[PDB]
């Protein structure tokens, strides 16, 4: 605790160079609410540089993970699901090359794991880690 | 001693074994007859030494004056093996005439030939990329044996694992055509069993003919028949 | 083995019935004997219930 | 027959402007043989401007259809399947926006329908139609 | 704990036959089920006359089962089906709980008893008549000698 | 230690039926006692009879 | 070598903290309901992880 | 039934609950919910289980 | 006059035992009985305690 690698090694592994080769650090973008009143291009842009959210016991809003997995749910037509995959990859949002890392929430089988760009994740992650470490030290 | 009336304990076991052996042997014989009829177009007649009796081994391509189609598929070659089976499907279709009522286009073959043809570059994309299973009519109907079925382009491959087929011999023939495959049983070789309707496979208990033992005599008279032998298309597979 | 019950052939109506038997592979072995007699009933109802 | 719309209306519908809105004219790129000794970029390039093949009763090698559907088979890791989707969309091979058109061969459920580019399909289709019509007329 | 040679008669010496061999490196990219199917075909070629068998099973341990199944070539196939409750053994027994997998004609079966060394599986056909036989001999008394 | 398998092969008929073990590693302990008598059968709860 | 399995009994905190490690987080997330005999044989009676 | 974040929602369709009343309580805690039956109101059924 | 292999059981392959051999040519030279004596010692060693 108190920035004893809780924000120095954790963020280093979050950015890393082998966290892409291994699993972990995955953000799920399911359907329903994620599509209400949004275009495909708008949703694809929002997916990039999208930090974490609640219910994450590890780090809550722990910066931008290197892997975002979008899956197919019941209130999601295959046009919407395959719409994001084509829209995202257009703006440089390439897919994970490891076939074992393409998994969903057990059920809702169709799930694609998309790897973010380095510029969209590592700078922001480092800046947030530095700010959090400074704030913890100033206490 | 004909204890089929007071069959208390041992009758239903020794008797069951005896008939389960005799009919097993007769079934082996009958399977040999059927496979000889379908593969070689002839009645299975042999001597003790294994020399064919020409008086009884009547061919089927001469008894009716019809000729089987012939073909050859080389799996190593680049031509799609099912393209060849597509053409020779029609050749059998045309010869059917105006009473065509076939159920399926069986291309019964061996395990090695099955694997070789399904592993062809053109075929694997459909065998691996589909083979829905539990949808082929044969697989649903049988559902009680281990045999591979692949119904591609009308052609319905069926791997035969009974060991009666030599490798590189695929025998394409329609299934369900009425009065195309016929079989006949005949009575025994007794004066009592002459001018009597055949009762299947016979079995007798001979006691008084000898003294050193008592003999059980089993006698089966059987012969298959392929009348419309112009629809079977023997093939040759090189792998 | 194929041949012992191999009716096959075609014989001939009237005589020469094939009495197929013998020439069957058959080896007799001794069944190993294993006792688990190691026991000593104290009362056990003498295992007589 | 004899070029009586068999190559004038058929090719017009093959290129069309509503054949994308409707279904039909779909080429399946399954696995196994399609991946033997090929890179992801090489396979993606080969998928573009890939004419039809045998077993097509309609037109055999009937030019380049506007829709190519790649699906997931048993001898295909999810890295390979999602590899093509990201590689293809990079070189302008966008996905169909109709969710009803994302279907496979019944089984092997994961299937994505990719719409080709207009330049890669319509010019070649028109040229092939013109050549076929000329050859049929010269007979 | 030493074997009695006067009673431990070998099997593929008493008849005059020999077993087959195999090698399945699940780390390599070659499909394990390709080798399994090849050995299945080689076994089928060695039956000949009757050649009627219920199923083709491969008896493996949990480690071997999971290593073969988790192969990249077999994963998707296992994830989609995993038996799909459409296996001969699963429909015949329906009560015993063990992993099964039918693929390319061979039925992977998981043996959880500790009797099998890791990295050792044994292919063999089920249903072949009189391929496996066993018998109970009488007691060692003079009253149960020549008695059922 | 290192494996326990009873019911070995053993010779048939007249032979040694080993009903005891000689070379072993045995220990003796006293098994603790624990009564829970805390109760009071009411005159109605004597339907056991 | 007669062991059926190799169990590592732990608590909820230990289990949830040992499997959320980066090298095993993905493997846990992408797991199957046919884990072993434990989830199969002892299922529908004890709700454990 | 919806078991999210340990919380296990359970919809009650028996009509005994007024809307806007969710009653969170642990399940399986020993001797937390107890019930008692009593004898009748007869002289024969007094001092009787 | 063809052997019935189901009854003709070689003794060596039956008892799990092997037999001895020899090789002598008496036309050239030397005393052949040396090989016979060596075989005698081998046999009596095989009998051993008898």
From TrEMBL, chains A, D:
This is Uncharacterized protein. The chain holds residues 34 to 172 of 298 of the full protein.
Automatic annotation (TrEMBL), chain I:
The chain holds residues 149 to 198 of 339 of the full protein. This is Major head protein. The lineage of its organism: Viruses, Duplodnaviria, Heunggongvirae, Uroviricota, Caudoviricetes. It comes from Vibrio phage ICP1_2011_A.
